[PDB]
Amino acid sequence: GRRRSVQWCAVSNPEATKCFQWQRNMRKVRGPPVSCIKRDSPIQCIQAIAENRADAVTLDGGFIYEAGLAPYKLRPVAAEVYGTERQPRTHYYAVAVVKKGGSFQLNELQGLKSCHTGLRRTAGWNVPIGTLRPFLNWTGPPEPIEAAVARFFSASCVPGADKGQFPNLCRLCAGTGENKCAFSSQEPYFSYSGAFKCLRDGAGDVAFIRESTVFEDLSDEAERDEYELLCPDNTRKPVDKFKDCHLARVPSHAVVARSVNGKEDAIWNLLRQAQEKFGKDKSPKFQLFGSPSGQKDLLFKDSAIGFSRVPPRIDSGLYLGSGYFTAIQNLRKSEEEVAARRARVVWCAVGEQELRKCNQWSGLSEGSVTCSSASTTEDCIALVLKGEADAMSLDGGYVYTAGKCGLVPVLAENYKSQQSSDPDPNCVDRPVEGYLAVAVVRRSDTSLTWNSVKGKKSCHTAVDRTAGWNIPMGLLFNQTGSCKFDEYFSQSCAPGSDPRSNLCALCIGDEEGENKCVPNSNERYYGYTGAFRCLAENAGDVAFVKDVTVLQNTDGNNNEAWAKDLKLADFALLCLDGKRKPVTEARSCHLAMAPNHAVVSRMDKVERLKQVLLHQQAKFGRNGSDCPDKFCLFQSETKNLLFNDNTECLARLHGKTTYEKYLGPQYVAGITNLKKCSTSPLLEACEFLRK
Numbered sequence: 001g002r003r004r005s006v007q008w009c010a011v012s013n014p015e016a017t018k019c020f021q022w023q024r025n026m027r028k029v030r031g032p033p034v035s036c037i038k039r040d041s042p043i044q045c046i047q048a049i050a051e052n053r054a055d056a057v058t059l060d061g062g063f064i065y066e067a068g069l070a071p072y073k074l075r076p077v078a079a080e081v082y083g084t085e086r087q088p089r090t091h092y093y094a095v096a097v098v099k100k101g102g103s104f105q106l107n108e109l110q111g112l113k114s115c116h117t118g119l120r121r122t123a124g125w126n127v128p129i130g131t132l133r134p135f136l137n138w139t140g141p142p143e144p145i146e147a148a149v150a151r152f153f154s155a156s157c158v159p160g161a162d163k164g165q166f167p168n169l170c171r172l173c174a175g176t177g178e179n180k181c182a183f184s185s186q187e188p189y190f191s192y193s194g195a196f197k198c199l200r201d202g203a204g205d206v207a208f209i210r211e212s213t214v215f216e217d218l219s220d221e222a223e224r225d226e227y228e229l230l231c232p233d234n235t236r237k238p239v240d241k242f243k244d245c246h247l248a249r250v251p252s253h254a255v256v257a258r259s260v261n262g263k264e265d266a267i268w269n270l271l272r273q274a275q276e277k278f279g280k281d282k283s284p285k286f287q288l289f290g291s292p293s294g295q296k297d298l299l300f301k302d303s304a305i306g307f308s309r310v311p312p313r314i315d316s317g318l319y320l321g322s323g324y325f326t327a328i329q330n331l332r333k334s335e336e337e338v339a340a341r342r343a344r345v346v347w348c349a350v351g352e353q354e355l356r357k358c359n360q361w362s363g364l365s366e367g368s369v370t371c372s373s374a375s376t377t378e379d380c381i382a383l384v385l386k387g388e389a390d391a392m393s394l395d396g397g398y399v400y401t402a403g404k405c406g407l408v409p410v411l412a413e414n415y416k417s418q419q420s421s422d423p424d425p426n427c428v429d430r431p432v433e434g435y436l437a438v439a440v441v442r443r444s445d446t447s448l449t450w451n452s453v454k455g456k457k458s459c460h461t462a463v464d465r466t467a468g469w470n471i472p473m474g475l476l477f478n479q480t481g482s483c484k485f486d487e488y489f490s491q492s493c494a495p496g497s498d499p500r501s502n503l504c505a506l507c508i509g510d511e512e513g514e515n516k517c518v519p520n521s522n523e524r525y526y527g528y529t530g531a532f533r534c535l536a537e538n539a540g541d542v543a544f545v546k547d548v549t550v551l552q553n554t555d556g557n558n559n560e561a562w563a564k565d566l567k568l569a570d571f572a573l574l575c576l577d578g579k580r581k582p583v584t585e586a587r588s589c590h591l592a593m594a595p596n597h598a599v600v601s602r603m604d605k606v607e608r609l610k611q612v613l614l615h616q617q618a619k620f621g622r623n624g625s626d627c628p629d630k631f632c633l634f635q636s637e638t639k640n641l642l643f644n645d646n647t648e649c650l651a652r653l654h655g656k657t658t659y660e661k662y663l664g665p666q667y668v669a670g671i672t673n674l675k676k677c678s679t680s681p682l683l684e685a686c687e688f689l690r691k
């Protein structure tokens with residue numbers, strides 16, 4: 001396993017030949033070993049990698065999609081970089097290239113002849129087709145969209161299209177015989193290069209390529225002046241005006257490997273080196289990013305400048321981006337099924353118990369709300385990226401991270417006013433006031449104070465929640481200035497921590513002693529109530545929760561047996577000034593103000609999410625038209641499932657529609673600062689995917 005020699009998969013004769021020369025300058029620099037396997041096509045390459053007969057292959061976005069699917073489940077490990085040394089970029093522009101003289105806009109291509117890089121390819125098929133869907137009058141399954149494309153343009157070249165079913169798609173392929181319109185070099189008109197040629201040769205009226213092809217293939221620059229682009233706003237502009245004129249901005253090709261025992265480091269090292277020795281202009285012996293006058297893009301893209309390593313949290317789905325990923329699956333959808341999905345809100349539920357309540361809510365939503373699930377919040381943030389889930393209510397800590405992931409706050413949870421209104425009929429426009437983070441202890445614990453909580457046992461909501469962690473740990477951090485957060489207290493129950501750390505030391509898992517230290521309600525000590533249960537059961541010595549938590553859980557405010565007999569007066573708060581106060585004085589005895597939990601989504605889901613959540617609260621809200629004979633959206637009672645049980649309503653954001661503006665300057669400064677002690681894999685994945 002983990003390495004030795006990495007078997008690359010060639011898809012061509014001249015790829016094997018380059019793969020073989022590579023094999024050789026490598027051990028001849030006494031570098032890491034690359035051995036080569038052969039096949040006729042990208043999927044044979046995908047099958048091989050999956051049946052362990054090869055380890056890697058650089059695929060186009062289109063095949064990364066394909067490759068991620070079962071029973072493959074292959075992962076991008078390295079992305080190619082484009083542009084130049086410092087203007088390096090892991091993405092390109094799908095453009096629509098035409099010759100000057102004609103005037104016909106991208107809305108005027110019906111009956112035109114077209115040249116495609118190849119079926120299933122990003123700029124060549126996926127985008128241009130996904131872009132003109134409107135005009136195609138397509139019926140939807142089971143009629144392949146190919147049939148609709150074949151009926152749109154007069155004749156086309158699309159390497160890989162079915163000759164037989166789809167005659168016209170191959171029509172202008174220039175290959176000879178069984179080679180006519182094939183997904184290989186045997187076809188003069190394949191890939192970015194063949195497709196531009198098709199255009200050049202008069203064969204096609206439009207070429208659906210990458211933005212660099214005309215610069216890579218037309219030397220004299222007055223030669224280049226014979227083309228222009230078709231902009232999406234039904235315009236025409238210079239081939240160099242591509243940042244202002246492109247169909248899409250897609251992810252660069254990536255090297256994919258198995259995601260089980262994939263030899264990811266074996267692969268990274270070999271790439272890391274080769275790129276050193278033989279990368280852009282260095283060591284003539286060989287050239288990793290160049291192709292013998294005959295061929296083009298052998299094994300990798302002509303003129304790539306290196307590789308960029310794909311952080312492990314990333315999969316096909318996250319690799320592709322929701323926009324794109326979703327776009328490939330919509331090509332196998334009716335414009336009905338596609339509009340159904342759009343109007344529908346997919347909720348992400350953390351753990352089983354929230355799913356139950358989700359199902360339940362779903363059942364009563366008149367199909368507006370459907371449910372999704374994951375075991376952690378982070379996993380739930382990822383399905384929203386994948387466009388596979390659409391929203392969840394989150395604690396401010398996570399709003400930061402989703403935020404970095406590009407999601408935006410949509411509505412915030414509203415709680416019992418500064419004692420402003422009554423069952424405030426105006427709780428949709430009442431600006432939020434955030435909640436109070438506080439440290440609680442047993443009254444009994446006289447001697448315990450702010451100043452001497454350190455090195456004792458702590459109870460936390462979970463790692464990365466405002467009250468529960470950011471605040472307590474950020475304040476202490478600001479003193480000692482240490483990153484060894486597992487040395488602040490002797491033992492804790494901080495769910496979502498290393499089950500092996502001291503920080504999980506006091507977690508109890510589920511009713512069966514399993515699920516211990518998990519960051520969901522199946523851990524008995526998880527969340528607000530859990531953190532408090534931790535204290536009241538003398539597991540921990542302080543509990544980091546909010547004030548309302550003690551109220552809500554004592555004096556038959558909570559009927560769980562754990563909580564029954566607990567009386568408010570038995571607990572106290574710890575002030576930053578070394579004093580101690582009673583739970584009623586939290587307004588003057590709290591660590592800080594936490595921002596209200598907020599519901600986050602993709603920008604594309606916003607207005608509709610708003611509409612649905614608003615409609616739906618009207619019916620199962622606090623004083624809810626169906627609440628509570630039918631369903632109380634805001635109750636799980638003592639569990640804060642999907643929403644905090646104390647939500648008066650979901651209110652409007654008063655213009656703070658950025659994680660930054662919502663969370664505020666100081667708050668974000670602070671998380672960042674804590675984030676450097678260490679970043680989550682998700683934050684790592686989102687940085688990578690952000691540049």
Ligand SMILES: *[C@@H]1O[C@H](CO[C@H]2O[C@@H](C)[C@@H](O)[C@@H](O)[C@@H]2O)[C@@H](O)[C@H](O[C@@H]2O[C@H](CO)[C@@H](O)[C@H](O)[C@H]2NC(C)=O)[C@H]1NC(C)=O
Binds near residue numbers: 110136137151152
């Ligand atoms: C796409 O549809 C438009 C209009 O949509 C409908 O056209 C109706 C007339 C019915 O047949 C519907 O069932 C149909 O889908 C079509 O206009 C368009 O192709 C037509 O363009 C043709 C070329 O000029 C022309 O022969 C027709 O006059 C024209 N529509 C009009 C005004 O009827 C379809 N484009 C396709 C299928 O690619």
Ligand SMILES: *[C@@H]1O[C@H](CO[C@H]2O[C@@H](C)[C@@H](O)[C@@H](O)[C@@H]2O)[C@@H](O)[C@H](O)[C@H]1NC(C)=O
Binds near residue numbers: 474475478479
């Ligand atoms: C947060 O840090 C601020 C900087 O002063 C602290 O810096 C340490 C290095 C140490 O010498 C301490 O004297 C200071 O507390 C500080 O002025 C703020 O009071 C700090 N506390 C909070 C939680 O705000």
Ligand SMILES: [Cu+2]
Binds near residue numbers: 060061121122253
């Ligand atoms: Cu490509």
Ligand SMILES: [Cu+2]
Binds near residue numbers: 395396465466467597
């Ligand atoms: Cu919170």
